Amino acid sequence: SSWWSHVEMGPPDPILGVTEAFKRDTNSKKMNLGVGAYRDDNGKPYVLNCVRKAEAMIAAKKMDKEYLPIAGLADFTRASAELALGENSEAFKSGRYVTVQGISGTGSLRVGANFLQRFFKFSRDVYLPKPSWGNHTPIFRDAGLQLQAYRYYDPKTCSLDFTGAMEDISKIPEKSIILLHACAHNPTGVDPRQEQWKELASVVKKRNLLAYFDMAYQGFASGDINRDAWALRHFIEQGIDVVLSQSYAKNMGLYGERAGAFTVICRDAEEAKRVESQLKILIRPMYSNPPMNGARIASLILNTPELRKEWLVEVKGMADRIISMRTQLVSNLKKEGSSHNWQHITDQIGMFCFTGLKPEQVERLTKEFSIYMTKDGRISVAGVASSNVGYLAHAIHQVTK
Amino acid sequence: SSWWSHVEMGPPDPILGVTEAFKRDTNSKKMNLGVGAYRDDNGKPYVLNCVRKAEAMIAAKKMDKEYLPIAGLADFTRASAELALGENSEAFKSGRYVTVQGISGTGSLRVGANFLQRFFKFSRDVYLPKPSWGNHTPIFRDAGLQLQAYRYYDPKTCSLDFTGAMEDISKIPEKSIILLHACAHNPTGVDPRQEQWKELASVVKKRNLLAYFDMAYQGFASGDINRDAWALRHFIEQGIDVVLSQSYAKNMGLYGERAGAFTVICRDAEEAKRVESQLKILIRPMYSNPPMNGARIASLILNTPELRKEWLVEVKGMADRIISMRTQLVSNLKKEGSSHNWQHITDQIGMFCFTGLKPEQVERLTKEFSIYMTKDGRISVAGVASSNVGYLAHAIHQVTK
Numbered sequence: 019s020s021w022w023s024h025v026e027m028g029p030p031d032p033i034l035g036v037t038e039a040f041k042r043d044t045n046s047k048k049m050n051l052g053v054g055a056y057r058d059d060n061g062k063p064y065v066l067n068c069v070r071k072a073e074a075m076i077a078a079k080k081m082d083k084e085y086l087p088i089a090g091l092a093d094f095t096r097a098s099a100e101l102a103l104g105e106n107s108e109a110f111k112s113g114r115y116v117t118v119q120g121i122s123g124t125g126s127l128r129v130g131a132n133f134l135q136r137f138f139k140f141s142r143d144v145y146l147p148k149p150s151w152g153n154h155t156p157i158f159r160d161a162g163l164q165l166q167a168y169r170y171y172d173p174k175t176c177s178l179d180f181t182g183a184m185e186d187i188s189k190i191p192e193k194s195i196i197l198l199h200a201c202a203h204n205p206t207g208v209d210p211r212q213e214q215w216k217e218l219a220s221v222v223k224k225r226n227l228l229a230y231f232d233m234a235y236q237g238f239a240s241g242d243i244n245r246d247a248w249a250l251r252h253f254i255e256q257g258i259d260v261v262l263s264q265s266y267a268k269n270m271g272l273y274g275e276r277a278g279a280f281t282v283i284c285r286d287a288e289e290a291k292r293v294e295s296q297l298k299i300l301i302r303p304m305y306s307n308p309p310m311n312g313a314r315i316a317s318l319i320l321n322t323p324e325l326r327k328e329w330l331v332e333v334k335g336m337a338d339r340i341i342s343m344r345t346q347l348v349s350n351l352k353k354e355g356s357s358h359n360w361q362h363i364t365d366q367i368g369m370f371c372f373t374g375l376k377p378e379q380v381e382r383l384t385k386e387f388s389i390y391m392t393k394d395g396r397i398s399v400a401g402v403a404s405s406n407v408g409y410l411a412h413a414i415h416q417v418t419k
Numbered sequence: 420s421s422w423w424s425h426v427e428m429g430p431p432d433p434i435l436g437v438t439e440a441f442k443r444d445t446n447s448k449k450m451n452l453g454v455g456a457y458r459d460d461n462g463k464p465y466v467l468n469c470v471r472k473a474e475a476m477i478a479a480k481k482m483d484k485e486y487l488p489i490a491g492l493a494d495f496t497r498a499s500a501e502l503a504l505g506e507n508s509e510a511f512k513s514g515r516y517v518t519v520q521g522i523s524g525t526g527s528l529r530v531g532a533n534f535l536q537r538f539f540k541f542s543r544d545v546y547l548p549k550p551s552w553g554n555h556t557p558i559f560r561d562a563g564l565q566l567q568a569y570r571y572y573d574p575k576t577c578s579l580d581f582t583g584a585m586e587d588i589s590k591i592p593e594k595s596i597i598l599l600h601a602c603a604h605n606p607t608g609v610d611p612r613q614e615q616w617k618e619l620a621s622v623v624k625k626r627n628l629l630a631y632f633d634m635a636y637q638g639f640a641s642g643d644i645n646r647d648a649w650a651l652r653h654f655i656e657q658g659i660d661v662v663l664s665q666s667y668a669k670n671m672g673l674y675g676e677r678a679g680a681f682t683v684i685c686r687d688a689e690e691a692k693r694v695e696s697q698l699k700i701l702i703r704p705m706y707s708n709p710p711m712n713g714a715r716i717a718s719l720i721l722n723t724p725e726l727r728k729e730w731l732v733e734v735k736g737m738a739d740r741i742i743s744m745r746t747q748l749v750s751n752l753k754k755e756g757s758s759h760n761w762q763h764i765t766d767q768i769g770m771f772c773f774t775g776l777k778p779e780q781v782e783r784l785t786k787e788f789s790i791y792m793t794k795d796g797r798i799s800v801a802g803v804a805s806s807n808v809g810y811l812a813h814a815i816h817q818v819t820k
């Protein structure tokens with residue numbers, strides 16, 4: 019034996035560390051701002067009603083558990099493309115796109131990364147925003163690509179470094195790959211405004227870059243599925259053939275069921291079929307065929323008028339609670355007599371927020387108030403409730419005054 | 420655009436070809452022996468009662484859809500290792516194994532291949548039997564390992580080439596990797612007998628090879644969970660610390676739910692934690708966390724005595740039906756006046772059977788008898804029913820007489 023004597027202990031995960039330290043707390047006033055999933059007003063996981071209805075429908079039909087085609091459930095992939103591109107999209111209607119079911123957003127990004135490693139002969143470089151979701155790195159690196167970065171978040175104003183971004187992208191070598199978060203940037207919450215997006219499209223177009231969109235929060239960010247997909251749809255309409263990863267983790271609350279899709283925009287239907295064949299050849303030896311449950315659920319909801327309708331109400335409800343907590347946090351901090359500028363908290367979008375707090379403050383926050391978050395000043399707004407937002411604002415004031 | 424113009428349409432699957440032809444056929448006597456999933460006596464997909472019961476249970480408990488840890492559902496991984504190693508296994512009891520949930524057997528095989536690519540510094544060569552499941556090649560190849568082969572199947576007798584296997588294995592450089600099918604070899608159905616396995620184990624031990632067991636049919640092969648895992652358990656007992664992939668696709672009919680696990684036998688519990696940390700680092704950037712449905716069902720079955728008990732009867736029924744068909748096929752070939760030796764048919768184990776039929780004979784069976792199979796003489800015993808076994812016997816007789 020002794021095959022593994024040299025395998026060393028891997029680095030501990032921080033996020034993991036806060037949660038655990040959180041559990042190990044007695045203060046009934048403790049807050050976990052490191053939670054990576056949506057939580058209702060009571061701090062409880064939320065299974066959507068439309069989701070429970072879908073499950074009841076599936077159960078009633080006594081469906082089989084036979085393997086899905088390599089590319090997944092057809093009703094799912096098509097519905098997925100339609101949600102993303104829009105019903106009257108030319109890309110959709112002409113069938114010049116190919117969508118394959120992936121294991122949620124992450125599996126989709128990986129299949130996508132592996133596809134580029136294999137067929138994107140023009141470059142090996144993937145440009146990520148500074149900063150980006152932690153997983154983005156190992157995803158591409160493990161896939162065999164080289165990581166690069168473009169300026170994005172401005173720590174001075176806790177907002178978008180629009181000028182740095184524009185300057186960086188303008189200098190990116192032609193035919194390089196650039197990853198863009200479609201909405202609700204993770205981890206900052208900083209997104210470009212419609213007008214800045216128009217401008218990015220143009221440079222991306224001019225530099226002839228391959229735009230890789232990561233769309234994990236459609237509908238969940240603003241409560242509007244069309245508005246959340248505006249940027250993606252704009253690029254395509256501008257003639258930029260992007261590639262895209264979708265997740266239904268947050269927007270349908272399908273977390274553990276793992277429903278997602280990877281999409282490639284092609285020149286035509288014929289090209290789309292060649293691409294599809296190669297995507298299937300790549301996935302087979304990865305995991306053979308995808309998990310059916312989440313896809314069956316998502317497909318029902320998307321394809322059933324009544325359920326789809328209930329879904330939009332529920333997603334909006336989620337988006338709204340988030341926006342509400344953002345609004346209430348700022349109002350409360352003001353009322354506390356805090357003199358700092360906290361408008362970034364409300365200018366931010368989605369579940370994650372870069373507060374600007376410093377490490378020593380985060381620490382004070384953790385030590386004296388039982389408020390757990392990562393040292394980067396990033397908080398999950400999902401961890402804030404109507405009942406604790408007050409306590410949170412209070413604490414933040416104390417540590418920052 | 421114009422990014423994918425150089426992407427060529429990938430080669431088509433021959434098995435797909437067989438299925439499509441089968442579907443097009445109008446002869447009500449048509450048989451599909453290219454089928455890769457179990458079918459009941461009526462030729463229909465079979466969801467086990469214990470599976471329906473486990474599902475109803477989940478529903479009843481109104482469980483959340485929260486993300487599972489990277490390594491998967493703890494109850495599932497533990498029960499999984501226990502199923503494989505046996506409750507009284509020293510390996511199990513001492514906790515010197517690490518099991519992680521994978522996307523069925525395939526994902527589990529890939530995670531394993533990627534793990535070795537990364538940490539198995541001793542070699543890059545993976546020796547597969549001739550032949551092996553088609554997907555084994557690209558799995559290992561895509562992971563970055565080099566493929567080798569060792570003699571296994573003897574076309575002369577439609578059985579094990581013990582001499583060739585033994586001769587090949589004896590010349591494998593120390594510390595190389597060898598892939599072994601635990602039971603129900605895919606695609607021949609030819610498995611070593613106990614005495615043969617004892618000799619194989621001795622050489623594997625002596626040459627200090629890392630044994631990688633692919634266990635995709637535990638309990639489904641012979642109807643006995645213990646007997647199916649005999650060889651695996653024997654290697655471990657002899658002091659060979661193997662790596663193993665388990666699938667619940669067949670044994671539990673979980674096909675599309677994708678429940679599987681990857682296991683590493685370690686020196687001690689200490690070493691196991693380190694390896695486990697490295698597996699987590701590998702998986703995160705692959706798909707982040709595993710699909711929960713299949714694991715939940717599997718865990719419930721294994722962990723609930725009432726259900727586990729019912730599962731064993733059910734898996735036994737599946738196994739018995741297949742054996743039954745093998746028996747009946749041989750008997751009818753005699754009854755038809757077949758002068759040939761059809762023993763291999765009853766000697767073989769599991770869903771696949773290498774008949775020995777030649778390419779031209781297969782053609783006739785297809786062309787004249789509407790019996791669909793691949794040109795390799797391989798048949799899926801699942802496609803055979805009490806109602807058509809007689810016809811098959813008839814047809815085989817006609818084309819080989």
Ligand SMILES: Cc1ncc(COP(=O)(O)O)c(CN)c1O
Pocket residue numbers: 121122123124125151199204232234265266267268273278706707
């Ligand atoms: C930007 C980003 N992309 C990818 C994902 C992956 O999500 P999942 O794999 O859980 O679907 C997420 C996590 N919600 C994300 O925030």
Ligand SMILES: Cc1ncc(COP(=O)(O)O)c(CN)c1O
Pocket residue numbers: 305306522523524525526528552600605633635666667668669674679
């Ligand atoms: C030998 C072998 N190993 C791996 C697998 C993959 O099974 P799955 O991915 O469907 O669980 C199978 C298919 N049952 C198999 O025959």
